[PDB]
Structure 1
Amino acid sequence: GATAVSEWTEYKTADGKTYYYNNRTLYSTWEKPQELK
């Protein structure tokens, strides 16, 4: 839920790929979640 959560982590590769890797459940998603929409 979009309540501003620090559990989610954003990483970039220097080719300009900002994919979200969350650090409590560890997600590799190139998609922008509803809480990061």
Structure 2
Amino acid sequence: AVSEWTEYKTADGKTYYYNNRTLESTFEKPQELK
């Protein structure tokens, strides 16, 4: 499927998903991402 949620993981131990829906990197794992 098309991943509109991009996986960015910083060594700090934070996975921030960058999406063009809010133009925002969210630290909440997308509930639709499966």
TM range (shorter): 0.5 to 0.7
User: Which 4+ runs in 1 deviate beyond 3 A?
Assistant: none
* Greater helix share, structure number: 1
Structure 2 unaligned residues grouped into runs of 5+:
none
The CA RMSD over aligned residues, in Å, is 2.1
Identity %: 94
**Which structure exhibits the higher relative contact order, with contacts defined as CA atoms closer than 8 Å and separated by 6 or more residues?**
1
Structure 1 unaligned residues grouped into runs of 5+:
none
For these two proteins, the number of residue pairs brought into alignment is: 34
Query: TM-score, normalised to structure 2's length?
Result: 0.56
